[PDB]
Ligand binder design. Structure first.
Ligand SMILES: *[C@@H]1O[C@H](CO)[C@@H](O)[C@H](O)[C@H]1NC(C)=O
Length: 97
């Protein structure tokens, strides 16, 4: 309920005080996914179980320097940094078959 309330306040941003903070959700985004030769791909729970703390941050970016209402979303995976740190980005480890 807290995450839903926060994202509601953000998408209906009318305060210019809040909505500048990325809202975090837990237990969402796996890291290690195997892509077999078939159609089905499998998120490996052996190498990393999805029952642990997995952070995913969100925030709605917008601006008027474009002189228009052209907004978009942006995600972030800053906790548990991997090589090529590059804050405010995502990374997926895939096991090809
Ligand atoms: C923003 O919209 C919500 C929708 O009800 C309202 O509760 C809130 O008071 C509004 N805030 C401002 C600053 O307009």
């Amino acid at each position: 309920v807290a995450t839903r309330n926060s994202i509601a306040k953000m998408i209906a941003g009318n305060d210019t005080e809040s909505s500048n903070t990325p809202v975090t959700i837990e237990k969402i985004y796996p890291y290690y996914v195997k892509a077999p030769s078939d159609s089905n791909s499998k998120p490996i729970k052996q190498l990393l179980s999805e029952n642990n703390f997995m952070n995913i941050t969100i925030i709605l970016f917008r601006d008027n320097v474009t002189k228009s209402n052209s907004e978009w979303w942006v995600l972030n995976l800053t906790g548990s940094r991997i090589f090529n740190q590059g804050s405010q980005a995502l990374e997926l480890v895939v096991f090809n078959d």
